[PDB]
Amino acid sequence: NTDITALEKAQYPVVDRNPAFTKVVGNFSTLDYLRFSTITGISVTVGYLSGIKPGIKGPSMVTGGLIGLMGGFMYAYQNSAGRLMGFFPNDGEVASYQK
């Protein structure tokens, strides 16, 4: 069996312990969507720029964008999860007190 109980947990007020996917991703603040967007840019820009030499600018840009999507999305997920769970600043408790 599994349990999301954590070490050093709940340092901030938890909003929803063990957030379900499609909710923790629907919790993306305009900062997360701005972290998932800058990582995908620095990963497309490096991916295209690295590929200027071997002639692969387009496809290396695409694979840098794939890496950036995966990484920046897992980072936005880390943030919105440690926010929904009690791990991060978590000023999005108004979303629970209002809904």
């Binding site: 900062l31 701005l34 967007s37 800058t38 990582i39 840019g41 497309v44 600018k57």
Partner: peptide
């Protein structure tokens, strides 16, 4: 009146990455 296809995408991406850096401090 434009450069090679794909160079434009990288130039746009750099602005969106730089916007994110100022934004990360802002938000």
């Amino acid at each position: 009146v434009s450069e090679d296809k794909n160079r434009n995408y990288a130039v746009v991406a750099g602005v969106v990455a730089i916007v994110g850096s100022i934004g990360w401090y802002l938000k």
